[PDB]
Design a protein around this ligand. Sequence first.
Ligand SMILES: [Hg+2]
Lengths: 62, 79
Amino acid sequence: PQDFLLKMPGVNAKNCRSLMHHVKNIAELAALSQDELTSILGNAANAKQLYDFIHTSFAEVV
Amino acid sequence: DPADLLMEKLEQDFVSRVTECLTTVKSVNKTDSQTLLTTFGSLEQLIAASREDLALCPGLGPQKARRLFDVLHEPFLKV
Ligand SMILES: [Hg+2]
């Protein structure tokens, strides 16, 4: 379950530690805002990457 | 076509990254994952999901449904 976490976009060896500290499990990742992710990662653009990975949706095809 | 071609490329790239995460789970497929993703729409719905909702993805054990619900819900910290 950290194997999962690490292949997530904008997550690297340095911040896998720090993030495993402020969030229970992957599920809770869904639950955070971009700003709350920035602060937890200290990288605003890393936070963009991971937040976008998670919140991007297909639900189109009209 | 114009750069529908680009939309197709960016789409495949994203999806194939989702597969990198999910196939981490105990032998859960490239196929499993594409279906998963397109049924749920986003990883956000996918993890907000119950072991019940997961099992509704057509194909996929209730076996595969457990393994994945766990990896997603089991906590990062143990000892
Ligand atoms: Hg499925």
